[PDB]
Design a protein around this ligand. Sequence first.
Ligand SMILES: Cc1cc2nc3c(=O)[nH]c(=O)nc-3n(C[C@H](O)[C@H](O)[C@H](O)COP(=O)(O)OP(=O)(O)OC[C@H]3O[C@@H](n4cnc5c(N)ncnc54)[C@H](O)[C@@H]3O)c2cc1C
Length: 385
Amino acid sequence: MHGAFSTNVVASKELQQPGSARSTRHLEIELPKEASYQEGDHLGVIPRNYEGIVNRVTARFGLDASQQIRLEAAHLPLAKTVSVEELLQYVELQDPVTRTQLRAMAAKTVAPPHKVELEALLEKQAYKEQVLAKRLTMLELLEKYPACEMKFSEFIALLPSIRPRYYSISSSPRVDEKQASITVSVVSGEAWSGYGEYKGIASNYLAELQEGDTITCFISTPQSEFTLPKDPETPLIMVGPGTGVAPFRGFVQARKQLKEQGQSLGEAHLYFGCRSPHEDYLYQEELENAQSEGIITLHTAFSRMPNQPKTYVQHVMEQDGKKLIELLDQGAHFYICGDGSQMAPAVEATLMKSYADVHQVSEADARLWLQQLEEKGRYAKDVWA
Ligand SMILES: Cc1cc2nc3c(=O)[nH]c(=O)nc-3n(C[C@H](O)[C@H](O)[C@H](O)COP(=O)(O)OP(=O)(O)OC[C@H]3O[C@@H](n4cnc5c(N)ncnc54)[C@H](O)[C@@H]3O)c2cc1C
């Protein structure tokens, strides 16, 4: 289920502070009559490959972007004439090199030591350590091996089809049913492969869009429900550092409308973490206003404030253990969003340890407690790698 539609960008702006070395974007997108969404839904984005990486390919093959050509034997337009540059928007250009890809290159290689090296990469250990660990691509190996006689049409056909990227919708449909926002951390750094500068495909595509540009996307609803309790007095604990705040911005906007409609709201704790308020404290103004209107209680942790200890949300949670565990005993829902590889597990461990300490039980009893909480639908994750 990818029921995709084309539509316009209504806003696009930077969320980090002037002089941050990093970027996080906020985009507002319009939705057509047929689409609709709910808090905790995702936007599926079909991205385009950026100019830099398209030019690296046409340069390697000595081709002009506009050169029309036709293929025949990825989801490629076959038996149609189509330029090179548009063919190149159908495929992934920076996935690790596959074993099929390596064999194809080896077979077209006429410098013998270079063939020995490409074949070396097929072995189990080398493949794990030099290809997969560093995310070494076919493109980077073609640039390294200019006398590999592979040709464009064989290149294009060996590549995977371009995949969508998911973003947690950061707005509530209770404010505007036909407009949705996303919050996009921009992937950028030195390539782990060693070949220059790395840019994440969808995130840099999204970062470069402007008001009036079009975008192809669809609404996706996750198998794991990530929604507010049915009763607005049921207490919430939300942990969402960095771009993890995204779905909680939707939660905040929802609660704010429910209040404006006379509903009473219970406690809602938002644990937010970032480097610094001088840098990446996304939506600070909105979140401080929300807190002032009693929509949330806000707890921050800063990793890089001069003259302060490095603080993460789990450290703050641990200080607040007693209170957070009493809340969960009264029927609170707990939510985590953001980084699933390090932050989520550590937050989970701190929650269980708070339980163990408060209720004087074993770690096994604390683990069973969390298991039961999840099975009741009260412990939800919107995390990613
Ligand atoms: C359910 C879900 C919800 C999500 N919600 C959000 C969200 O709300 N906001 C958000 O910003 N993202 C979100 N993501 C992540 C998002 O979908 C994209 O994966 C992310 O934006 C990166 O995709 P990309 O195309 O820009 O980069 P890609 O081109 O796909 O590259 C991604 C890969 O590059 C790797 N990489 C990173 N740095 C380097 C480097 N220097 N050298 C080599 N490789 C590197 C990454 O580890 C990753 O493996 C979500 C993901 C999921 C699954």
